[PDB]
């Protein structure tokens, strides 16, 4: 088996590690299946790409029968199989079996804490955000190892990319000195960012 | 895919050895290819193979040593002309060829005991 690891927004190529001369393709059956779900097939030299792939996949025939996924989605992660069957004498026989695993990275970039001045006396408002990551993020504000209370927070997922965007608002008093940390936890991973205030 | 076959089978005075190979069809079969492998010294060797359309009598070739019959997720393999010298472990492999997805199954191999008459 071979392991490929690309980042959620890259292109990924999964090689069948084998090829078939054009003269042979016609009497060949090639199945690219993930788990036991069909990615696409070529039979009688005719194509068939499944819905979930119908548009972001290129079957690079001449290059080791490999597939090229252009819009990596977190779901694309998994174990792919390339089966090649060639009809011989009495019937189709397996000519090649290939297995590849795809790892999609989708870490959240360092969050950005920006502040704005509101009409309130010395009450300041800082917004923390970060997006384009997976899985689902969980924000939290910390001053001194103390889990604060934010005004508003929202987490959303792009219905097409599967990626998440998080953002949150928190207010504090500009009088005292403050040292805030916006900690985001997604899966067994975490990434934050600290904002500092002084006099 | 899981494939089950008898652990041991002894041949006959002649040279005929039989056994049932049963596979776990996870779906609409249609095209299944059955292969009998002989393992020895950890070196595999095709003994015979055949593809049958789920719904037809498994039929091997003439070039072939084996012979068999199918009944649902079951196959009736019968090897022949075995000399006590080819006694050993006979793995039975099963493939779900069409329609895809492709599934592969390897049994543990039945141990065949054959003895060359006096
Ligand atoms: C005509 C041609 O270039 N064929 C490819 C070769 O480039 C590749 O390195 C090899 C890998 O197994 O498979 C064949
Ligand atoms: C099944 C599917 O997603 N089909 C779309 C098609 O509707 C769209 O017009 C085209 C634009 O390039 O991309 C593809
Ligand atoms: C605008 C302003 O200075 N607001 C209050 C201040 O009156 C108060 O004494 C202090 C106590 O920590 O918190 C802040
Ligand atoms: C301090 C602040 O921004 N508060 C807003 C609130 O006014 C608004 O009604 C609500 C709508 O979902 O979102 C929150
Ligand atoms: C509680 C937590 O996760 N803190 C992390 C800290 O360990 C890390 O060294 C820093 C790197 O920029 O980001 C913050
Ligand atoms: C489970 C089953 O039906 N096994 C049969 C056995 O009874 C029969 O005598 C033999 C003939 O070759 O084929 C096999
Ligand atoms: C389906 C079956 O018979 N599986 C067995 C497995 O449980 C056992 O641990 C192994 C020992 O070599 O042989 C094989």
Swiss-Prot record, chain A:
On modification after translation, the UniProt record reads: Palmitoylated by ZDHHC20; palmitoylation protects CD80 from ubiquitin-mediated degradation, regulating the protein stability, and ensures its accurate plasma membrane localization.
Q: List the disulfide bonds.
A: 16-82, 128-182
Every Ig-like V-type domain range:
1-101
**What superkingdom heads the lineage?**
Eukaryota
Tissue and organ expression note:
Expressed on activated B-cells, macrophages and dendritic cells.
Query: Is Glycoprotein set as a keyword in this record?
Result: yes
Keyword check for Thylakoid, yes or no. no
Keywords attached to this Swiss-Prot or TrEMBL record, sorted alphabetically, are: Cell membrane, Disulfide bond, Glycoprotein, Host cell receptor for virus entry, Host-virus interaction, Immunoglobulin domain, Lipoprotein, Membrane, Palmitate, Phosphoprotein, Receptor, Signal, Transmembrane, Transmembrane helix
Where's it mainly located? membrane
Membrane-protein topology: Single-pass type I membrane protein
A single GO cellular-component term on record: plasma membrane
Q: What is this protein called?
A: T-lymphocyte activation antigen CD80
Query: Which gene name does the record give?
Result: CD80
Q: Which residues of the full protein are shown?
A: 35 to 233 of 288
UniProtKB/Swiss-Prot annotation, chain B:
Which BP terms does GO give this entry?
adaptive immune response; B cell receptor signaling pathway; DNA damage response; immune response; negative regulation of B cell proliferation; negative regulation of regulatory T cell differentiation; negative regulation of T cell proliferation; positive regulation of apoptotic process
Its protein name is: Cytotoxic T-lymphocyte protein 4
Protein location? Cell membrane
Extracellular compartment: which residues?
A: 1-118
What pathology is it implicated in? Answer: Systemic lupus erythematosus: A chronic, relapsing, inflammatory, and often febrile multisystemic disorder of connective tissue, characterized principally by involvement of the skin, joints, kidneys and serosal membranes. It is of unknown etiology, but is thought to represent a failure of the regulatory mechanisms of the autoimmune system. The disease is marked by a wide range of system dysfunctions, an elevated erythrocyte sedimentation rate, and the formation of LE cells in the blood or bone marrow. Genetic variations in CTLA4 may influence susceptibility to Graves disease, an autoimmune disorder associated with overactivity of the thyroid gland and hyperthyroidism.
For this chain, the Swiss-Prot or TrEMBL PTM comment says:
N-glycosylation is important for dimerization.
**Glycosylation site residues:** 76, 108
**Subunit composition and interactions:** Homodimer; disulfide-linked. Binds to CD80/B7-1 and CD86/B7.2. Interacts with ICOSLG.
According to the UniProt record, where is the region Important for interaction with CD80 and CD86? Answer: 97-102
Instruction: List the expressing tissues.
Output: Widely expressed with highest levels in lymphoid tissues. Detected in activated T-cells where expression levels are 30- to 50-fold less than CD28, the stimulatory coreceptor, on the cell surface following activation.
More about this protein = The therapeutic antibody Ipilimumab competes for the binding site of the endogenous ligands CD80/B7-1, CD86/B7-2 and ICOSLG.
Task: Show the disulfide pairing.
Answer: 21-92, 48-66
Result of changing residue 12 to A: Strongly reduced interaction with CD80, CD86 and ICOSLG
């Amino acid at each position: 088996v071979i392991h490929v690891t690309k980042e959620v927004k890259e292109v990924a190529t999964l090689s069948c590690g084998h090829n078939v001369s054009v003269e042979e393709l016609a009497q060949t059956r090639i199945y690219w299946q993930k788990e036991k779900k069909m990615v696409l097939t070529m039979m009688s030299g005719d194509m068939n790409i499944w819905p979930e792939y119908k548009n972001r996949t290129i079957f690079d025939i001449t290059n080791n029968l490999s597939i090229v996924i252009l819009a990596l989605r977190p779901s694309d992660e998994g174990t792919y199989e390339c089966v090649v069957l060639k009809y011989e004498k009495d019937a189709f026989k397996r000519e090649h079996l290939a297995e590849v695993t795809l790892s999609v990275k989708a870490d959240f970039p360092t969050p950005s804490i920006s502040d704005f001045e509101i009409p309130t006396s010395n009450i300041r408002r800082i917004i923390c955000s970060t997006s384009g990551g997976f899985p689902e993020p969980h924000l939290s504000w910390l001053e001194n190892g103390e889990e604060l209370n934010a005004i508003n927070t929202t987490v959303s997922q792009d219905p097409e990319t599967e990626l998440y965007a998080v953002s949150s608002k928190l207010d504090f008093n500009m009088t005292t000195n403050h040292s805030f940390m916006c900690l985001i936890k997604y899966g067994h991973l975490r990434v934050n960012q600290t904002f500092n205030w002084n006099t | 895919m899981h494939v089950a076959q008898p652990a041991v089978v002894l041949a006959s005075s002649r040279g005929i050895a039989s056994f049932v190979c049963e596979y776990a069809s996870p779906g609409k079969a249609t095209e299944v290819r059955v292969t009998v492998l002989r393992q020895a010294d950890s070196q595999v060797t095709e003994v015979c193979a055949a593809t049958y359309m789920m719904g037809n009598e498994l039929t091997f070739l003439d070039d072939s040593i084996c012979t068999g019959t199918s009944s649902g997720n079951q196959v009736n393999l019968t090897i022949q002309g075995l000399r006590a010298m080819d006694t050993g472990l006979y793995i039975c492999k099963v493939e779900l060829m069409y329609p895809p997805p492709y599934y592969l199954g390897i049994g543990n191999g039945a141990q065949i005991y054959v003895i060359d008459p006096e």
